[PDB]
């Protein structure tokens, strides 16, 4: 039980470094490199994932 709780939270944190097809997993890499219309496409990918 302790190991399953820990692995589920470790997996949940490590999904934050996935792109899900966005240009980066980091929102600042999007918001600093794409304009207010183009950034939203990559943010919508990260949100969905």
């Amino acid at each position: 039980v302790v190991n399953q709780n820990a692995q589920a939270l470790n997996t949940l944190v490590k999904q934050l470094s996935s792109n899900f097809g966005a240009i980066s997993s980091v929102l600042n890499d999007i918001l600093s490199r794409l304009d207010k219309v183009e950034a939203e496409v990559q943010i919508d990918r990260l949100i969905t994932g």
Binding site: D35, K36, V37, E38
Partner: protein
Amino acid sequence: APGQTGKIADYNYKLPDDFTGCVIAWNSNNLDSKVGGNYNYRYRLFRKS
């Protein structure tokens, strides 16, 4: 057009990123070009932001 940038979009006339509406244009060379240049029309070249 919505989400565009350049010295007209940035400093003169900005459409919101989810503009609902139609943009309509026509060449006005006969009405608005003058033999030595038509200085009646000007645009903002600079802004603070």
